Amino acid sequence: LTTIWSISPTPNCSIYETQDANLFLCLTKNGAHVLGTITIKGLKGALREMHDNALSLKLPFDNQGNLLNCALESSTWRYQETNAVASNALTFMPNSTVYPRNKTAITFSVVYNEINSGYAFTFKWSAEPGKPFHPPTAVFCYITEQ
Amino acid sequence: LTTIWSISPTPNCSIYETQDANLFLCLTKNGAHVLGTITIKGLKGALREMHDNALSLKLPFDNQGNLLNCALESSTWRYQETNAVASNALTFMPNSTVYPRNKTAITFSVVYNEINSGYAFTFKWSAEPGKPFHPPTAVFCYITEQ
Amino acid sequence: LTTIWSISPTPNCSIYETQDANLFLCLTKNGAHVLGTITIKGLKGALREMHDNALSLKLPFDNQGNLLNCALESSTWRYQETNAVASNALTFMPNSTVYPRNKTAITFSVVYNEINSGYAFTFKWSAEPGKPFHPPTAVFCYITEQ
Numbered sequence A, B, C: 001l002t003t004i005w006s007i008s009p010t011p012n013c014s015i016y017e018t019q020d021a022n023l024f025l026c027l028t029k030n031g032a033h034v035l036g037t038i039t040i041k042g043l044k045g046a047l048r049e050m051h052d053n054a055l056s057l058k059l060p061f062d063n064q065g066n067l068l069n070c071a072l073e074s075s076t077w078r079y080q081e082t083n084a085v086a087s088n089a090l091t092f093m094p095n096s097t098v099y100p101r102n103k104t105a106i107t108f109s110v111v112y113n114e115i116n117s118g119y120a121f122t123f124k125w126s127a128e129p130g131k132p133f134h135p136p137t138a139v140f141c142y143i144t145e146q
Helices: none
Strands: A003-005 A021-030 A033-042 A054-061 A108-112 A119-126 A138-143 B003-005 B021-030 B033-042 B054-061 B108-112 B119-126 B138-143 C003-005 C021-030 C033-042 C054-061 C108-112 C119-126 C138-143
Touching: A021 B021, A021 C021, A033 A119, A033 B033, A033 B138, A033 C033, A108 A138, A138 C033, B021 C021, B033 B119, B033 C033, B033 C138, B108 B138, C033 C119, C108 C138
Parallel strands: none
Antiparallel strands: A003 A021, A021 A033, A033 A138, A054 A119, A108 A119, B003 B021, B021 B033, B033 B138, B054 B119, B108 B119, C003 C021, C021 C033, C033 C138, C054 C119, C108 C119
């Protein structure tokens, strides 16, 4: 399996209130690299008229590569090729030697494994107060766990 | 098949006059992502001494992923691995859900599916008047049709 | 084989003195493209308190894709999947038609095939005098030899 994504026609992400955003994250594995693209669109509430000037999204995983409860609707986190939920995706996780847990690591950033157990992505975007939250798509690349 | 490219030792692109440029576009598919690199070199005519300060190149495709008549010599648009023409390359086309047709979406840009039928890439570069057109190589990444 | 890397827990690179740095270079091949990430960390000597404001690293290869004697410890240059040394990696070499030998092609740059025989990567980073050498990770993409 090469691809995990969160494609959804309907809102699948909850930042300030339930299902107020659409998150499209796509990971494709090529050996030890994953290529990621991420697009987040604010749809309801304060995400249409921002008060803060930055927003973060954390996707936590267990030590086997399963998505844990978080802002993303887990039923939308699927292997694209089979359309099964993206369970046990250890070889898509950020490598814990290259990115040890809790190591230090419009603007965008991604930090890997800022979590006490398992794995994580922490995304951060700047935001413009008074405007809808809808940052440009970002592309990133990281080394995976074996 | 992983790779489509337009490699050519001789001019294979017509911007202002016949065969006045060399276009090297290389697409490699990794699951739902394509990684693209594009290099265009002006060789003859106004491309050696630009009058305008921007230039675009559109590559249109039918709904099956075949390149339609355009500035690129179609005989150079080939699957690298077999050296056959890159016919029916649907799974290299920009995804029409992620990039709906006609949706809004040195400088470089790529816009996907700005076309009424099928698929497209529209590339745009800035140019420096009075100088040859030969922008730096650009790398881009997009989500493919399934 | 998809992946070559230089992962090492201990110093594996010699810039000013023996084993004064850690080089982590990871190449993954997807058809005609390689995606590369490179991280270099200065560990000893002047690399902890720079005098110059730029540093280069050249990785030379023979015409068969074997790493030749250079600043990187060759025993750490391995196919990730088999953990064998990365011998005869011709299809990871920068394409000699796209990047002809000796053709012209914090800051980072990579130049391909600046060498009289075989293949090469030449990396260059800026550095801040008085500070340790530890530039941000860089990601790059190139076309491979067939």
